[PDB]
Amino acid sequence: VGSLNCIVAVSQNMGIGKNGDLPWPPLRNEFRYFQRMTTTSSVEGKQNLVIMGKKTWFSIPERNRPLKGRINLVLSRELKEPPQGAHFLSRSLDDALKLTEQPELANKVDMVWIVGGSSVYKEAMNHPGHLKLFVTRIMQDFESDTFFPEIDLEKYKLLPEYPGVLSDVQEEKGIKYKFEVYEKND
Numbered sequence: 001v002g003s004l005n006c007i008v009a010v011s012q013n014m015g016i017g018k019n020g021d022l023p024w025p026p027l028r029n030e031f032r033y034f035q036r037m038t039t040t041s042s043v044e045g046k047q048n049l050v051i052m053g054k055k056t057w058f059s060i061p062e063r064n065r066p067l068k069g070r071i072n073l074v075l076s077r078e079l080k081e082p083p084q085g086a087h088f089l090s091r092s093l094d095d096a097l098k099l100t101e102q103p104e105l106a107n108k109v110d111m112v113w114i115v116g117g118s119s120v121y122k123e124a125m126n127h128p129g130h131l132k133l134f135v136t137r138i139m140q141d142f143e144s145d146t147f148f149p150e151i152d153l154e155k156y157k158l159l160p161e162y163p164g165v166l167s168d169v170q171e172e173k174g175i176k177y178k179f180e181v182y183e184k185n186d
């Protein structure tokens with residue numbers, strides 16, 4: 001299995017969701033960036049794996065789901081089987097990561113992308129090892145009810161550029177935003 005990554009879009013006040021939807025109006029090119037980064041596999045014959053909590057899964061429009069061209073894994077202790085359209089279910093992040101090593105997935109999975117929500121990001125971010133964060137900074141405040149965890153910059157380097165990631169300021173619907181990549185290894 002290849003790299004472990006988180007990907008998020010976050011307002012200036014650290015918001016990532018409101019009422020199960022985005023705090024901001026839809027940003028079409030931002031979403032296209034998310035689809036491209038999560039889908040594009042570095043390795044022939046493999047797909048990337050997306051890991052998400054249960055509320056994140058159900059926030060994807062019921063069409064739309066599963067995220068196409070990726071293996072979709074949902075985290076829940078309540079559910080007894082994967083949701084309609086999902087491929088895998090695990091009780092914990094540690095369990096999902098252990099699962100990628102099973103005969104069933106070990107040769108199928110390239111990159112692992114954690115795509116939300118809060119608690120899943122927090123645990124990934126605080127777990128030892130080599131991890132990257134792909135963070136879209138939405139440069140306005142937006143009312144939110146779910147937030148991105150603190151990024152400890154002692155450990156997460158901001159990289160000075162990254163292939164495939166534009167470095168300049170983007171704007172859609174009057175909303176400026178920019179792409180960043182962080183990397184820790186501990």
Ligand SMILES: NC(=O)C1=CN([C@@H]2O[C@H](COP(=O)(O)OP(=O)(O)OC[C@H]3O[C@@H](n4cnc5c(N)ncnc54)[C@H](OP(=O)(O)O)[C@@H]3O)[C@@H](O)[C@H]2O)C=CC1
Nearest residue numbers: 009017020053054055056075076077078091092116117118
């Ligand atoms: N980039 C962005 O701006 C993103 C925004 N979002 C948004 O964030 C919100 C959803 O996020 P949030 O409210 O944090 O919820 P989560 O998606 O993380 O869902 C929480 C539920 O998932 C299950 N769960 C989460 N973590 C684990 C774990 N380690 N092990 C087992 N089960 C786990 C639990 O379910 P159970 O009770 O069944 O055990 C929990 O009640 C929505 O607003 C959505 O729009 C989501 C992703 C990215």
Ligand SMILES: COc1ccccc1/C(=C\c1coc2nc(N)nc(N)c12)C(C)C
Nearest residue numbers: 007008009022030031034056059060115136
């Ligand atoms: C309601 O959000 C979605 C709607 C349709 C398809 C996927 C998403 C998700 C997340 C991101 C969307 O833009 C995104 N942008 C970035 N930089 N990271 C993210 N994690 C998302 C899922 C996982 C809930």
